[PDB]
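Forwarding the complex inputs:
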Amino acid sequence: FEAIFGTFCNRLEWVYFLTSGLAAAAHAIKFHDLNKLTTGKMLFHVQVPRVASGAGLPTSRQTTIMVTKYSEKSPITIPFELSAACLTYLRETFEGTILDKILNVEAMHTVLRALKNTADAMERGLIHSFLQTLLRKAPPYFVVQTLVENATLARQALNRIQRSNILQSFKAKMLATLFLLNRTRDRDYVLKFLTRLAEAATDSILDNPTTYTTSSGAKISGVMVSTANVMQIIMSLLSSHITKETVSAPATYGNFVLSPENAVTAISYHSILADFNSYKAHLTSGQPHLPNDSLSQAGAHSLTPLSMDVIRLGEKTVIMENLRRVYKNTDTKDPLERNVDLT
Amino acid sequence: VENATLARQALNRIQRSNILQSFKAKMLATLFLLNRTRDRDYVLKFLTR
Amino acid sequence: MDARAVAKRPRDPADEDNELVTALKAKREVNTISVRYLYHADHQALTARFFVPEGLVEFEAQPGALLIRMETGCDSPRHLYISLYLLGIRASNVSASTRCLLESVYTASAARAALQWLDLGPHLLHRRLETLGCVKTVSLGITSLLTCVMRGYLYNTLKTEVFALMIPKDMYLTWEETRGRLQYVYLIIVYDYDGPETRPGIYVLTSSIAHWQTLVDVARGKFARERCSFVNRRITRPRQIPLCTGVIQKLGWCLADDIHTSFLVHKELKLSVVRLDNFSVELGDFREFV
Amino acid sequence: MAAMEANIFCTFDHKLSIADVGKLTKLVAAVVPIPQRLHLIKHYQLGLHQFVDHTRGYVRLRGLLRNMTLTLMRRVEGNQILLHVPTHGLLYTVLNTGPVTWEKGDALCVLPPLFHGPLARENLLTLGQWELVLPWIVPMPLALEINQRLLIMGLFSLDRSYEEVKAAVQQLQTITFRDATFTIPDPVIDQHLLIDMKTACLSMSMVANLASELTMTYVRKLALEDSSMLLVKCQELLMRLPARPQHVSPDDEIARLSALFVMLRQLDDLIREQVVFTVCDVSPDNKSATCIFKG
Amino acid sequence: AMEANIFCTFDHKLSIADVGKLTKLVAAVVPIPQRLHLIKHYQLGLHQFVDHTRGYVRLRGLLRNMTLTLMRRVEGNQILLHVPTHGLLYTVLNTGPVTWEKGDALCVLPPLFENLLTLGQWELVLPWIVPMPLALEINQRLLIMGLFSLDRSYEEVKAAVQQLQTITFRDATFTIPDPVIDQHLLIDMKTACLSMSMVANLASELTMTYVRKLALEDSSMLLVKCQELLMRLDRERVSPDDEIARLSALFVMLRQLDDLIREQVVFTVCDVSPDNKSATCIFKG
Amino acid sequence: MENWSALELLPKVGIPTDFLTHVKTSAGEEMFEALRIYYGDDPERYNIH
Amino acid sequence: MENWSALELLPKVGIPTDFLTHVKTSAGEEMFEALRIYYGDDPERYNIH
Amino acid sequence: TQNINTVDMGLGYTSNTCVAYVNRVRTDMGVRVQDLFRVFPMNVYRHDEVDRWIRHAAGVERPQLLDTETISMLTFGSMSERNAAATVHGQKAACELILTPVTMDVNYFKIPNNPRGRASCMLAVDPYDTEAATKAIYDHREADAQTFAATHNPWASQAGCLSDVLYNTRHRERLGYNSKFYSPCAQYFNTEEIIAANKTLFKTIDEYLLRAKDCIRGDTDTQYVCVEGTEQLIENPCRLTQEALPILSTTTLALMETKLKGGAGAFATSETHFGNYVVGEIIPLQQSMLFNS
Amino acid sequence: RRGYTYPFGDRGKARDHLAVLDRTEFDTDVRHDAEIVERALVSAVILAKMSVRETLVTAIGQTEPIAFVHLKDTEVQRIEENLEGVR
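Prediction (whole assembly, nine chains):
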């Protein structure tokens, strides 16, 4: 005889956007009516201090700039398929025999398993798309370092010599740092490179002050991601500064909804101003400044803890995570494995 | 181990050539490991890997 | 079988649960997906998906147009999906201004290759082309996605609005002064054999006539000059084998009151078109008349 | 604004008797033509009687009927008749109006009625010098033979004298089909038929010119050493007056024969009617059948 | 929720391996002779129609009269066939030797060639699904090879027949069968070829009189050019009852050729898998 | 053109922030999608319709 | 140019209006500015954005 | 479908990317120069016997393509040469060869430089001044940047010279051009693209992130350009700098033997004999890449 | 023209020999005519032999000789005597 031992079905592992460290880089708000609109704009009003000039020299003027920020759309899709057998047996019975019961169980489990797999794939696609939009906008290291060294040296639109110097710094630092981990491993150099890379970015506009806090110590600021190999190298090298920690994260998406005064303006003038009643109250009360923005109001309330790695770059704390899990056995190439070419 | 993340598809010719380059490099590097070096950190890293 | 079951009213998809809802009800499980109501569930129109190069998409960025499949004998992509508006650049039934405008607008690289393939072969346009009905979405890029209906009422996903079909003004032809409330619309190709080239004309014809014999009778009546040209080339030049002074294809039924005249804008250039809003597609094959 | 109606109600306005509504009930599931489609129409527009004129040219009636729309009759009740327009491809039931026998597996066409026997059956709602004259549903061979004989008679009318034409017309007026026989009413030659004559003769001369040497010589060559009743009949029809073929060129020959194929199609379309019905199994009494509506 | 279906019972026993062989044809096309509800397996396919004297065009005519059906799941002791209705869409298996592209038009042809499962006095055979231009080309080539059947002795005819026999299409280069056997013609091919040649012959000597009579009146004036063309053809080279018989012969011979003149546009195709054997399409009358 | 007067008149949320480069350089070098810059005081905000 | 979708969707006050002429003539002869004369039921009022 | 909408709540750049760790090289780094007859398949010599002799001696088969219509299809784009039998090394790195005078100052190679002989970085020129940029990139009667001579390669710099008409993708279209081949120096001669690219600094780097990148097929031995979507684009610092890198090359085996014989750090130092020289790689790639391999 | 119209078992070789055949107008020089007619005649003979599907000498360098095909012995004798008289 021929013996068949135990048959195994794959124990597929689930993953979520919120449970991943990348969620700390993100603010997540859920909005059931998103399909209808295609425009999202924010506005910034800033007045720049002017130092009182000395005698004889040209004097400054009271000056302001007004700037707006716009929305990027990037919907994601996943198909899944059902055969005729499942579709016809899911809604039919034949004589009520045992084999028909087996077929019904198989069809129901097949369709529900397909739905579960599609939901997991949709979550993976959402985190993938967020990484896509984050990485497509991040500039490289040498340009941001050249910018951070030149902060004071321009106070106007760039003149010719200044941008020539910018280009010189570009070329020098590009030759200096086209690769990092393969060239030098003296821990001081790599740690100082990491802290420079962190300090280069400007901080976020809207803090969620009671999110992604360390369990007791302090508040987290940055999130950085790499493939498993680079993460292993860094963890081996920087072991003195590496710590384990439990952090608090929002357990669910934040809910944002239309108040009726928003709906009437939607119908009338094709526009909504968020947190409308707060605007009307603080306007008629004659007060200039609001406690919170609508986005921060939309933020979720409950907190749940989860474990992740964190290191110190000097008064700044940044999150470690390697995204190998989200593409462990999938199709698409992990976006963090980039190709760079030279001439 | 190193080439696990680059292709979960039908293994293409160029990836195969890279596999062979890694073969040629690492076979020469680790033929007589313990004879070659007794550096404690390196041998622990090799065993962990 | 029982009398009550036979007499019972027909099954009601109108309020009965969708299959996914039935399964999730059965196991008592909930996914994050808004599983209850399926989009396109009530759709009667048959939909196809087509990929097209970026050059041809112009004038399709506005929804509604005829999408035509043209042949090329090369090993590399054998078919190219072309729009009726671009096809007018070849027809001799287009005014000089409109042809110049279309020639200026479609000067993308891919379009001119299709124009070369159209006239680089011995065969006439009749054997080379085939119709795919009406196109109704855009997703731009280096390669763009089109979705198209081959047996349809022409509508947006939620059916929130009907989508019209636009025909360029120079091609539009009518053979009756009064219109019955129902009339069909056809695609018409005729050939001029007197010129050195087999010079083709492109026409779109609306008529209240559904029966083939009388429609062909009227067509031969109006196209008498072209028929005489065919006979003249046949007698004049032996060992040549011309055929089918004109061909007909049936493509549409529409309610005559719906017809309107409208302008169409793209690349801030302005085109003149005729418009049919409450349109539907019915597709037949090409057929020959002499 | 407008909507294309599919359910059509016809209302009478003559003070009908009981026998009229009785005969209406007999007509259930028959086919009737309408010139225009509305939700409620008057009886005067229903039926073919509105078109008849003293000239009574059969070709005129055929051409007029070709343009019309076809509908089926359902749920006959007092002075209100419901007509349902057919939808292409669906399965419908129909009761044949004329006496022509049907068979399963063939196709049917629409034609104006014919003179048959004593001309007894005109009882169809004769009221107020108006009557419900229904069109005929007949199988494909009979319709093709009718069109063939009308066109052939029209062609023969030319190049012939009056009495020769009269004899030929009196012969061609008859038809035989499936153990039945019928007579064509008023097949007078008219300008409508002259258009068909012109287009048919043009197509026939084109097929004559496009024919290649091999196609023409095939029949004469085969008569040399083959023999059968079909062959002897075909040879007897033709006029009476080995070698290597004069020219061989499959490319030019295939182009020529394709052009001749198109021309033969064009000549054939003159007699082919619109194929309205494809039939399924029929009740053995021949009265009613199940059919699919096409075209 | 059930739908309209046709039940078929295999009168011969089917082994498990044979059922597994047949199940690979989930959505292939199968013709049936008559629209019964419970059909016997002998009626399926085109095997009962094949004959040793009757030819290909007879099969084409019978297939035109045939009713087309689509297959459904095979199960215990019974197989289910779904008859299509116009303007819905269905899945078909490309049994033909020609690959398809989006927007192709298809028509059904009688077959010309693994093999399909057989029984003691039975084999199962299915028709071809082919794009329309290739169907025209193959019918034209097979008919023209029917014409050359008479002259086959000379070597020119053999070379020309060989050249006509090969057909080329998109990544397809198969060969069609020679319509002659033992230097003889199958009788249906003889009838079709003779009918075409006769309808060609009759028009050459019949049109002149009727054309020259109509020339006096045509305001469209191209009929006179037609007369001149016929006279140029003449330069290149009766009792009324005989005349009327000749006209009747012309039209009956033309009707005989109508078996091959028009094409049923059965299917139009929607996008196809790389499994290209399988494709989706919309059914047309 | 956006309704800048709405931005000026309506209440705001106070956020301390600093650009990487100098603010005037970021506006002058075209980094933002749309800009409105005025020197002194533009009375346009006081006119409403 | 007028937001007709707003007029359709928004609530409205009932009045017994009395046009001097037959109302279809007033629409036909452009007594008012900015008309809209859709026949049947026009579903365009639903596409809220 | 789950349509997500993102707003960038960052005034300045809030996120940075860097190339941390480098793996093995997909290209052979070799001198295995590419076939011009494949990229220009149209042209033939006038007298057919001369064409036969040249094609026989050169090692390239006479091109034949179905009918005339294939030439339009090829111009639209088609991969049209066979993969090699075996590949122990990776892709055949295409070398383009641009004619160059004998007298060229050899020091031009020893630094990161533009191979066209005329420095043309668009972060230097004034923004949106096409006239000034054209003057900088073509006008050889005004001093160049980075080397204040008029040019270091007369046959490669001028608008009408060899290396512009041959390499520039907009000019190349005037001749037989298979678009599928990624010409290495295409990005150094697309004067139209370079003139279009000279936007303001912030928008320049934004475009560099968005659209300046290109793609290369991973399935094939040779540098085929791909349709965007199947494989992600390639980051290119050289495109941003409009410069090129120098690689260790020597014109005699003795100096290469010294480079191999010498200890660590010998790769980055240049040296010259009477008529032979070494140009050292400016980045220590040959050591670092093999260090981890 | 006859080469264009005729079918063949291997069309490519026939097309190549027709291409070397179909443009042979004389270059108005006494010397050149003999060599060009020699080449054209070689092409014509090889095309005829391929049309008959007679064997043809494919050996390298050993080009097909100039000869008649399928002509009777009496006629070829007469033609050869006429050519001897021409000499």
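The helical segments of chain B are 13-29, 33-36, 40-48.
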